[PDB]
Design a protein around this ligand. Structure first.
Ligand code: SAH
Ligand code: CA
Ligand code: CA
Ligand code: CL
Ligand code: CL
Ligand code: CL
Ligand code: CL
Ligand code: CL
Ligand code: CL
Ligand code: CL
Ligand code: CL
Length: 194
């Protein structure tokens, strides 16, 4: 399918290190040891980073190629991570309620379609523990109107999407590392709690 196609090679988000915004959450004390889920984990850089910093990590992604490459990376780097092929819009059949202390989202929200957004928020909300944290990284949208392609998320769009089920702690300007020529893209980091 679609996501197997993009992993026939190295897509622009598929950097060889964890995203700096998530590394900084470790440095700032915001990500503390617990059970963590990386939704749309790709080839596993952020998930492995969380695992090397005291978390029990599960990563879920639609693309078997990404999951297979993520697993091999964890094996190479002597780290234990639970990498599984799966659909975040169906993960109620994979995880029970109130399971994860942390959910990280590095570019998944960015690709979730409008008609799947409410369902997406509900599934993320369901698998998080009481008091659980959701950290989401996306490209920032500060331009009036919605002509920009690919989509980018404004603070209003983020607030409108995640306020119904989450308490928003902050939406911070950050950088998103990319393989494309402006290798640093303006981005938002949402910190939210269940
Ligand atoms: N419904 C869904 N369920 C699980 N994964 C999904 C999904 N829709 C898209 N994805 C995955 O979400 C990822 C977005 S690209 C981001 C990959 C990784 N988080 C990184 O930072 O490198 C892709 O790997 C894609 O296969
Ligand atoms: Ca806009
Ligand atoms: Ca937008
Ligand atoms: Cl990093
Ligand atoms: Cl599916
Ligand atoms: Cl279903
Ligand atoms: Cl479970
Ligand atoms: Cl629907
Ligand atoms: Cl418009
Ligand atoms: Cl880079
Ligand atoms: Cl709640």
């Amino acid at each position: 399918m679609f996501w197997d196609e993009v992993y026939k090679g190295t897509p622009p988000w598929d950097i060889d290190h964890p995203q700096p915004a998530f590394q900084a959450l470790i440095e700032s004390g915001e990500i503390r040891p617990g059970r963590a889920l990386d939704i749309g984990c790709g080839r596993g850089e952020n998930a492995i980073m969380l695992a090397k910093n005291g978390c029990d990590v599960t990563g879920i992604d639609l693309a078997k190629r990404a999951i297979s490459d993520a697993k091999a990376k964890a094996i190479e780097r002597h780290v234990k991570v639970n990498f599984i092929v799966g659909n975040v819009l169906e993960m109620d059949q994979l995880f029970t309620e109130d399971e994860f202390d942390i959910v990280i989202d590095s570019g998944l929200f960015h690709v979730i379609t409008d008609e799947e957004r409410l369902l997406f928020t509900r599934h993320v909300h369901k698998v998080l523990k009481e008091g659980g944290k959701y950290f989401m990284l996306c490209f920032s949208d500060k331009e009036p109107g919605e002509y920009e392609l690919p989509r980018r998320a404004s603070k209003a769009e983020i607030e409108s999407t995640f306020s119904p089920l989450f308490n928003i702690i902050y939406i911070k300007d950050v950088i998103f590392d990319s393989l494309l020529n402006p290798g640093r893209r303006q981005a938002y980091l949402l910190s939210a709690t269940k």
